[PDB]
Amino acid sequence: TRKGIILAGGSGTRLYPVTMAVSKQLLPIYDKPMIYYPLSTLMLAGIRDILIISTPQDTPRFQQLLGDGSQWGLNLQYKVSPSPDGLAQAFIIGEEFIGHDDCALVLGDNIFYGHDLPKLMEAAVNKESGATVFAYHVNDPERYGVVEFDQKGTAVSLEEKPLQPKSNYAVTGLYFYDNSVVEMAKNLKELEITDINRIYMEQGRLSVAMMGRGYAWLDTGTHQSLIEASNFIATIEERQGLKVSCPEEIAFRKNFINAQQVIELAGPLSKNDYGKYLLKMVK
Amino acid sequence: TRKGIILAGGSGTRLYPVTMAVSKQLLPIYDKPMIYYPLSTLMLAGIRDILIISTPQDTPRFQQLLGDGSQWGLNLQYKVSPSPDGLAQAFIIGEEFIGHDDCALVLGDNIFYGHDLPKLMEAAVNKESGATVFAYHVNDPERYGVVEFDQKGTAVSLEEKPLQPKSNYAVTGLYFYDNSVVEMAKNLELEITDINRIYMEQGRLSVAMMGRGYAWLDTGTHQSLIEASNFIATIEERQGLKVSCPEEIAFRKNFINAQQVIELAGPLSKNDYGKYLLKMVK
Amino acid sequence: KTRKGIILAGGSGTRLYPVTMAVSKQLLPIYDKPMIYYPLSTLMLAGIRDILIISTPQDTPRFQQLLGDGSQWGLNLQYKVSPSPDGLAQAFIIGEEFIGHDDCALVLGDNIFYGHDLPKLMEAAVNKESGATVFAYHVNDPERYGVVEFDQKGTAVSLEEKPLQPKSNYAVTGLYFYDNSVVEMAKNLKPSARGELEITDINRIYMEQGRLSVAMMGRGYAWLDTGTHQSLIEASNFIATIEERQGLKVSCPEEIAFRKNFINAQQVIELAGPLSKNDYGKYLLKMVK
Amino acid sequence: MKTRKGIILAGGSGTRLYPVTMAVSKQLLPIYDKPMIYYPLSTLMLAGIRDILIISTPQDTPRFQQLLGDGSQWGLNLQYKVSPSPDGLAQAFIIGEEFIGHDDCALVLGDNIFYGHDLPKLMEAAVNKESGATVFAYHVNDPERYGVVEFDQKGTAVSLEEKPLQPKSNYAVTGLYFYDNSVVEMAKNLKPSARGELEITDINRIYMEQGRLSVAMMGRGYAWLDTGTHQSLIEASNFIATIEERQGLKVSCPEEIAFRKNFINAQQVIELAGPLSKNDYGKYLLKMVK
Ligand SMILES: Nc1ncnc2c1ncn2[C@H]1C[C@H](O)[C@@H](COP(=O)(O)OP(=O)(O)OP(=O)(O)O)O1
Ligand SMILES: Nc1ncnc2c1ncn2[C@H]1C[C@H](O)[C@@H](COP(=O)(O)OP(=O)(O)OP(=O)(O)O)O1
Ligand SMILES: Nc1ncnc2c1ncn2[C@H]1C[C@H](O)[C@@H](COP(=O)(O)OP(=O)(O)OP(=O)(O)O)O1
Ligand SMILES: Nc1ncnc2c1ncn2[C@H]1C[C@H](O)[C@@H](COP(=O)(O)OP(=O)(O)OP(=O)(O)O)O1
């Protein structure tokens, strides 16, 4: 079974004061809570069993918002982060959730857009040994974590903010692992996502999914990039008449739910265009 | 003493799903929680004693954000809304807070901008009998609650979404009352509009006019939220000033000194908000 | 036979005063390109390389200054001055000779089309062999545009200018495909109620003969009629946003000419020369290599 | 018999703006709902300058004439002259020696957009200053990018540096300048810089070396744009549209300025609003006059 984990805690200090009483991942990107975006991304890869890891104060808010996800044909489960850092700790926290299956991990503040994205993810899910990281062409590689890679798609170096960037590809917050990752994390010595990836690479089992022209990616963690993301979503939706990362639309079009369940869900949203969109969609 | 009340609850249903787990008044307008804006507006009128009324679930979040406001030279107090509606119920809820003083009321989703706004508010505070509502020129009066008024500034009719608008002035969510309002509310769901019509019927209702130069947003829809955010971002970036920055207001009105500002700028030093406060104090 | 197109790039742009008092509307920038780059790319994307541009007497030479004969892009551009303030169907009369025996497309100079699948739509309309294909766009306010109500076959059944009782939510956009019989219609047409030969008149005729198809632009497609101050700035912002966030140029003729093999990487490099002081030139260079 | 004069530099190639400036002068491009040149033009009007020389290229000068006429419609006197050289901006004072006569002169660049409630007070001060020149400076976060002026507490310039690696100040020199009549003389007796041409910067350094160069300071509250790139063009348009829409006022609307400063009456406004009645510009002018 396809599983995913969403990292949806943290402090959001760069967003103070708006993240002082509101989790970053609950902030609106246009007309949806931020977390709808990484969540839709998992849904588009056919992942219906998802663990959401958040802080002690805000975990119940996510539960208030998302329930158990059964309304969308999903199974959402929740777990509280024990440590401020050590993101690879996710695989330890969710060892049980993961069981014997392969797992995807996506960061709560990551916004992915692209017609061909699901094809990219289906390939990563199908790969059977190792891991697939997702890389995005940037003009300023020096600013992100940088992956230099093979023509096969195999990673050859991983460098955090390299002064001499080996490539123009930034590593995004979307990752695909086989089951051996839980094992790595347990036997790792704060535990970093980067360490885990370097391991797969050292074994040659690390692939790189390339997001080139046509793709958009935002790490929504600063006042500026939040408002850029909101505007980007608002513009795309208004000009091209489609919703971006609308979980009800995705659940419906992938047959997780029927037109009736959609109508009931559109009820509470009927005072705005979100509800009315869902209705036009089902007929 | 100058008192104010902020209505910061409600359901924000037009904003679903973003208001499903986050109070509307905690949503960001650019780089500040929405409530910073109505709160600054009160500060600019010299109001330092403010009651914040919110829902049971979100009231603690506002307290987490704002504390008791002592950091800004304010005295913030909190109270939970008992009824889904009946906004005039504010004066009943805060009867004790208000005591014998005059009171201002501002809605949590109202964003006011204008160089001359404080002059307008100083006049409304100084008026001694009755009430001052704040009106904003709009191209579509039929949309809002409309106030038709005298050349004296005295209201002569109040009409909710009139099909035949008597005027182009919409009533905004900023109101100034004398102490007699608590009394009206007790003896009156209880509407802010009813209360205003009473003052008007007694001739004691003035109208503060916000014409060209002023901006006003009721941030209650996805479209207007993003319009507001963009407006704030644009003004701040192009003209180098912050809109409704409580730390800046507290400092420039001498509620706090340069030191308290520096300590407050600490947590915000990872972005331009903190850095602004620092350039400001020197 | 050869694919031909005509761009209507004149008019007064009165809604845009005062910015169109000394500048043709179609030369105004939508972000980083003159407006006319957009309908012009749209034709290129349908593989149309022979294009007639019809403009006003004062501004026709400015278009020529900007575009030359289009040979730099593997095109053949030709120009003709509009004789009458109105009567858009007069295009087919003006270009009777340009058109010769071929089929023709017509696009309005202020129309901005965007959509991944747009070329497939247009290839279909080009291949249809009798009649005409109009292009329709789902709107929320049909009452505001000219409205086409249509069959499940794709055949138009009514055409209504700003209907009070809209028969459909589909607005007719300014992109049309005709077979050669259109020149004939236009020559034998007589003015509407406003004294002039209309594109709309021509379109119903085809519909009355059952030979009028409707290309449907649904979700995924964007369309702007850039003719008011507000819409001009919405269009500019839309282009800037797409280009910046997704790393691609919209309606960049040099990119289109290159990717459809009208021109090689060398011609691109020479064309990128004059634009090397901004991102437009630098984009063209990254594209080649 | 002293009169306020200004000169607008409104030629140039706009090469950073290719391809949109290939057949359209940069200064005729729209910033929201007005041709770019409306903005520097309004700026001069707000300083009470009603006699203005517009210098442009040979091909585009007639387009400015088509747009603006002789400015009599706005209570102005507009005159035109064609730039002889691609560069040498100080050549403006030579080209307009006759226009200027014995009067003081202001110079504003065609692509410069100034906004600020208090801007006219600033400019009235500069016009009143009687010996020397006033340059207009704008606080930036990246002084290294512009021409930088370091100055006195008196307001007297003490150094001028083009894109200093070690910026002596955070104040960029904008394209708005006020001169006394002695400037025509400087320009005639000036010799090319290291790039072959008479510079505005050379002229200013001279005033400064004589101590007669003041600095008008535009701090918080003020906006300034040098609209010469695709990005900045669209930022300026957006800024104007936002201010106008949110605050209900027009920015650099010459008909409004002519009317409020009494260059023209409510009737002339109504006739001018006629052609613009199909959009909000016309309709604004009408609401304004009543
Ligand atoms: N301890 C944690 N448990 C769960 N999720 C976390 C934790 N720390 C961070 N996250 C989430 C928040 C983001 O969506 C993502 C990457 O973190 P980051 O983008 O640095 O946000 P942050 O909350 O760390 O911001 P800041 O750097 O301003 O603290 O991981
Ligand atoms: N019962 C209440 N207690 C306190 N504040 C309230 C209450 N109801 C509404 N408010 C606040 C929220 C707004 O800032 C303001 C006006 O309400 P409104 O703008 O209708 O928001 P809302 O939360 O009612 O939105 P919905 O129509 O209601 O989308 O008063
Ligand atoms: N006589 C003409 N010859 C060639 N092209 C024309 C003519 N009239 C208009 N056009 C162009 C301009 C537009 O791109 C398109 C549709 O015209 P329209 O959108 O009404 O612009 P316009 O110039 O007529 O604007 P306005 O209504 O403000 O005058 O056809
Ligand atoms: N020879 C000239 N005669 C009159 N005006 C000029 C001349 N050269 C430039 N200008 C104007 C255009 C601008 O508004 C202003 C400053 O020039 P600048 O901003 O460099 O534009 P430009 O046209 O030189 O752009 P580019 O650097 O892209 O050529 O002076």
Ligand SMILES: [Mg+2]
């Ligand atoms: Mg962090």
Ligand SMILES: [Mg+2]
């Ligand atoms: Mg981040």
Ligand SMILES: [Mg+2]
């Ligand atoms: Mg309500």
Ligand SMILES: [Mg+2]
């Ligand atoms: Mg509201």
Ligand SMILES: [Mg+2]
């Ligand atoms: Mg027309």
Ligand SMILES: [Mg+2]
């Ligand atoms: Mg049009």
Ligand SMILES: [Mg+2]
């Ligand atoms: Mg230059």
Ligand SMILES: [Mg+2]
């Ligand atoms: Mg410049």
